[PDB]
Symmetry: C3
Subunit: 419 residues, 3 copies
């Protein structure tokens, strides 16, 4: 299942065995709540003034990450909202949602949307008010809460709450939206992840109807191989401080096979791991040639120019990986690995080393205690000469950030042909 390789020569590790789930698109749906135009008994009198005020307010209401592009997260959802402001467009919805709650309406600008009437307060208030109290206070409370979410979030919320869309409604919404059966089961078995990648956009109150758009994720890439790249500073370990040179692979992040290429997510926080399934958003990704994976096995390969940064700053630190820990120990720092019940079992030397989570519960670098992940899986240590040893410190470029193996090699050549 989940496996991990560590590369001694580049101070990096790769975790594989993951399956993709990439948000590639959005499904937009119009959620409606029907309202009443009103203008043990006392229990409703105070719950009815709660109502009037909610409507009152609802109306008053209306390393490599820098290489990423810039999207507009809710542009699709807002595009649907602008349509519902057209005249007769709200009444078209109101009409279709007459004898049923779930209906697909064709909107006037060539947009077919799944519309859902999730609460019928109009039918409730006009039939009952003008046991019963129990239903009012509960249906009303949902209205108050949807209102609260929208007012402290300026009409745009995420993750989409159970108030905006109940588990019942969401699951049904998922089942009725037209996607593959794989997508349907994936979404159904991960509704909280779905909720976190969703948007709720307050749209309109007009003609006794409250409407908001829910923007749900389309996962157009499913079950392709994914892998995470961890990198840590690789430094020489000479005696005199300040005489050392350092190199870090800057291409750390999530990598997923996708449509003949590889999706790269430089900010691994924009991805959510569930056992062995990785949920990412393609908005936070670059599209690279699959040759990028060649940088793990051979960082000097002629097909892809592996990206690195350089410095003279040899501080110690650790990177906790999926199945172990990379340790970059430099200078006078104390770095150890421990077992929970027996204590220190490995003291690290200067340089960059690695330990697996088998038998190890924590790692210590200086004054920093890291707990390691205790997921089961196999680790492989790939011995190799640390590539930083291949450079003369006297002509090593000591502050490169957006750089690569070739860019450094050219800078060096310019400095050598020089002498």
């Amino acid at each position: 299942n989940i496996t991990e390789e560590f590369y001694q020569s580049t101070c990096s590790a790769v975790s594989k065995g993951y399956l993709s789930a990439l948000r590639t698109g959005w499904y937009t749906s119009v959620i409606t709540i029907e309202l009443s135009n009103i203008k043990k008994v006392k229990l409703i009198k105070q719950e009815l003034d709660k109502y009037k005020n909610a409507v009152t307010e609802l109306q008053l209401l209306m390393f490599l990450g820098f290489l990423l592009g810039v999207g507009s997260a809710i542009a699709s959802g807002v595009a649907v909202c602008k349509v519902l402001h057209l005249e007769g467009e709200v009444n078209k919805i109101k009409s279709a949602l007459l004898s049923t709650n779930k209906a697909v309406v064709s909107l006037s600008n060539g947009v077919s949307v799944l519309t859902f009437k999730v609460l019928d307060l109009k039918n409730y208030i006009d039939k009952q008010l003008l046991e019963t109290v129990i239903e009012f206070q509960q249906k009303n409370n949902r209205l108050l809460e949807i209102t609260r979410e929208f007012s402290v979030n300026a009409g745009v919320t995420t993750p989409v709450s159970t108030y905006m869309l109940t588990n019942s409604e969401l699951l049904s919404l998922i089942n009725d939206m037209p996607i593959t059966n794989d997508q349907k089961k994936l979404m159904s078995n991960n509704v909280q992840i779905v909720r976190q990648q969703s948007y709720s956009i307050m749209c309109i109150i007009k003609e006794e109807v409250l409407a908001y758009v829910v923007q749900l994720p389309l996962y157009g890439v499913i079950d392709t191989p994914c892998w995470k790249l961890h990198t840590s500073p690789l430094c020489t370990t000479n005696t005199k401080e300040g005489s050392n040179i350092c190199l870090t692979r800057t291409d750390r992040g999530w990598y997923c096979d996708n449509a003949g290429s590889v999706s790269f997510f430089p900010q691994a926080e924009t991805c959510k791991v569930q056992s062995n399934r990785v949920f990412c958003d393609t908005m936070n990704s670059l599209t690279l040639p699959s040759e990028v994976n060649l940088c793990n096995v051979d960082i000097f390969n002629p097909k892809y120019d592996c990206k690195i940064m350089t410095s003279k700053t040899d501080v110690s630190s650790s990177v906790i990986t999926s199945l172990g820990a990379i340790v970059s120990c430099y200078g006078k720092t104390k770095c150890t690995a421990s077992n929970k019940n027996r204590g220190i079992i490995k003291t690290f030397s200067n340089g960059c080393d690695y330990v697996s989570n088998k038998g190890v519960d924590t790692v210590s670098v200086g004054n920093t205690l890291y707990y390691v992940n205790k997921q089961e899986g196999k680790s492989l240590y790939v011995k190799g000469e640390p590539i930083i040893n291949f450079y003369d410190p006297l002509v090593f470029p000591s502050d490169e950030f957006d750089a690569s193996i070739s860019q450094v090699n050219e800078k060096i050549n310019q400095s050598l042909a020089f002498i």
Copy 2:
């Protein structure tokens, strides 16, 4: 209204037609809740123990962004809190808020604050408890909720909720605070934005009074012209990879005319757009000469030194603008623009191009789907030779970040006079 120009020569676009609303200052107000010192009937017995415990806990309680300065967001509000800890200062408030709820108190350190008694539980509990239940459970619930917000936020909350300050109270607070009529209407028509720029600071419980300060935004700059600058990487498109050079304008962000100068907001996320009104915070801004706008029309102009970064990293991406999309297509990437109902309508060539939101619903760069904003407005394409063609790649500085047109020109000159 909203208009947009794209500049082919610098791979950038400018959206104009916006009106400012800058938070320049803070208004601090002391909000008080009066408490009781106590020590169908059973409904109050359990709601009264809710009360005692809330009081219990309330007492237990007490690119260019790096160029920004560093403020202390609630320094003004906390400065008022320290005054209420002085002896007799709480009783001064308690005294003025006797026969009315809304009063301006002069605090002992030369601070005139609008004070508001938003809930009188002391008068309620001592007159009623020592129909009725309905009022208790509702007034009490507000107390419990204010308490919850403060305990999970360590006494400082934002956005300021409806519990801290009701729509009623906030609107009235806005109307009574002494600012211009323009500010009053601006704040009143945008109370949720106001709420998001506000702070609630738990201050004190002493002498049967709960006091917290609400820190509200002063908008001292209103209705001046604003514009957003979008930039994207400009790269040469030579055949052999790694032989290319790239240049990005780094001065992207919001720009607002302000007091003879221009306020620049390098992190466009610190600004909130409402139709054509832009809410920014001057804490997240630099003050530049208005000559900075010369960089859009002529990036080689002699009055301002336009800021850029350089690299050799030609990855594709898109920037979704206000009225269209900038596309930076490089290497073997597939980049398209589509209409919702007809599909691909433009395939982009290598280099940096632009498409408007008229007729276009989405843009695709590699595996990344961007929806474009569907706001109405006019786009203008300004043809020009891409300036990256004006540089010899053999003497081009390939990793500059905090740089400019002149700094690069000097670095080149140093490399040319050399040879």
Copy 3:
């Protein structure tokens, strides 16, 4: 108590007088809720269907910062969760929590955990349901709220709410967990800070038991001296623009004495100040030699290589410190300090200056108004020649980021021996 020194020569200031409180480790505890397997009267009928649905969903559910390492924040807590999925492990807990609510269970993998039964709905529903309503609706509400938190957060919450763990339970939990009496009082007097550094991890529903792990902070470093370093750009102030050179100390952040070394926190936002106590997390820290403090008194000292960045970008800004304000005024910018009731009292000249919070309420740099902190304490102005005057602009490296005094001196020497 709190004191501050400003260094004119390096445009930096140091705030001392603080006491540490570092999260060094985690305490994990298993919190259990016992459930019923069921399948004025009507009040319970609707509150009982609330129950069934909550269980339904609960089951469906299951500058220098770049130098930091990367941890896994809840690796310890999740490691305990995996144990409770073993067979008989839930029943071991269920067994010990029979005749009492608070018990220490030895888990099968050599982990002794404090286990807490915080709500007994099983005993309630099976004894009462199969005055009374008041208790049900209140105990049930807690269940619904724990459920809501977990569903919109995918089973991991922070800060840990009063629903996950009441003030009562938390205080008792703190008292029973085996730490020093200093830690116990520190945690007890700061429970909201404790809550913010805590994690709640949804673990399991099996055999009529709901279990989640609460991950609480261990403060292994307490009451050591702490100090905050503020830095601001130091630039020459020549007439012609673009002819100036700039230098910024990049080592700003929190510094705490710790186990013979100094813990450095480059992102001062990962630290929370309470009067004179500083709460930090060692995960967001580097371990440095105590010699790093030598950079404040003598930035040219031979024991530690003080870190700086260089540029040609002389923009004005201010840094609000603990007891005053650093002002970096350059070019044509208007920079002032004011008193609340008398207005402008100091106009700053070009260069980097400082003002204390005694008599000063605000500082203005360009269009940016900063309020200063009004904490009492002594400020000391240490006069010195600004070190940027010691460099020839013609051989000054104008874009260094990850650099230091020596690295710049070497780059200069390479440029001088050259000529």
